[PDB]
Amino acid sequence: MERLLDELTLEGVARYMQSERCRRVICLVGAGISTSAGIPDFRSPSEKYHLPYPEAIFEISYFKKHPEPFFALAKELYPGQFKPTICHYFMRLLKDKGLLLRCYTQNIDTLERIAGLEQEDLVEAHGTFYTSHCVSASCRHEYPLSWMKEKIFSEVTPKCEDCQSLVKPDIVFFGESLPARFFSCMQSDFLKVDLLLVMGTSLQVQPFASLISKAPLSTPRLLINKEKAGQSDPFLGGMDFDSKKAYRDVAWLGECDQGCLALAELLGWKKELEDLVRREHASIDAQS
Ligand SMILES: CC(=O)N[C@@H](CCCCNC(=O)C[C@@H](C)Sc1ccc(Cl)c(Cl)c1)C(=O)N[C@H](C(N)=O)[C@@H](C)O
Ligand SMILES: [Zn+2]
Numbered sequence: 001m002e003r004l005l006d007e008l009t010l011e012g013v014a015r016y017m018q019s020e021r022c023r024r025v026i027c028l029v030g031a032g033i034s035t036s037a038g039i040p041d042f043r044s045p046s047e048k049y050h051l052p053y054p055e056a057i058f059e060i061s062y063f064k065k066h067p068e069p070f071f072a073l074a075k076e077l078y079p080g081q082f083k084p085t086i087c088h089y090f091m092r093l094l095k096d097k098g099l100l101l102r103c104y105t106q107n108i109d110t111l112e113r114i115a116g117l118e119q120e121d122l123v124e125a126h127g128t129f130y131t132s133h134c135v136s137a138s139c140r141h142e143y144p145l146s147w148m149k150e151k152i153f154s155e156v157t158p159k160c161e162d163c164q165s166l167v168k169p170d171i172v173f174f175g176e177s178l179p180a181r182f183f184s185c186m187q188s189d190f191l192k193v194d195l196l197l198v199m200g201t202s203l204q205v206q207p208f209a210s211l212i213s214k215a216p217l218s219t220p221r222l223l224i225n226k227e228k229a230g231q232s233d234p235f236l237g238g239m240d241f242d243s244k245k246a247y248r249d250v251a252w253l254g255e256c257d258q259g260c261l262a263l264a265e266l267l268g269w270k271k272e273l274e275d276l277v278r279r280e281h282a283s284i285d286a287q288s
Pocket of ligand 2: 160
């Protein structure tokens, strides 16, 4: 066939990546790339906040009237350390190797930035804790994560120093639209992509999940995930890993860290990746 992968395996993807045909990689990532960092999947299975209903703690209208439950939940689930995973540093290596067009992330945990992806490299489709803003439209003072953490830990509701309005993390609450950046980057990036690397997402949250259908028909798509995902739903109506018509989609099933290690090893990057992770982890462990 005219297909770009010589075989539908991780080995086939690595050979394609190091061929002249593969210049621009888009990563699509979800909570599975951060579970080994101790960040919980807010959407996965596994009280004192006295909400009118459970979903209120993540809705924008409620947050603006009663922000204390959200910031109480924030301190409770606040991670004791922000250490990106092997997967995050694999994407930094892609950037270093000149291969990363964009990382679209479902995650709000900031680990992509800590691992060295820059604003231009990222589409934080669901927002982020990395910056926060005064909610007053005429003010919009920006506050960094260090300022917000101090307010959350001292259990003081964060208020703007300029105008005393509430300060909200730049997360997309329910009732808010996705950032315009998501749609503007999608319209351009998918004209240019040679490889989709889908890591740690089961492609269940829309419109993010629809990004896989924006790839050109020839673009190979590798899923690294604990479970197979992204296939067409036999009910509702996609990834085709297993039919006789399959030609470009590959599933590597396991922990995201181990899949990225396996791919890096095939690429000849295992020592580079180990050295990067050990150095960055050491630096984070040594923060004083
Ligand atoms: C306008 C629109 O499209 N919004 C989408 C959802 C977009 C944001 C989803 N953010 C996440 O996943 C991030 C996770 C960490 S959870 C989270 C959520 C809020 C907060 Cl505040 C916090 Cl801290 C954590 C939407 O509602 N999609 C629906 C769906 N079920 O796919 C349906 C309409 O298609
Ligand atoms: Zn303000």
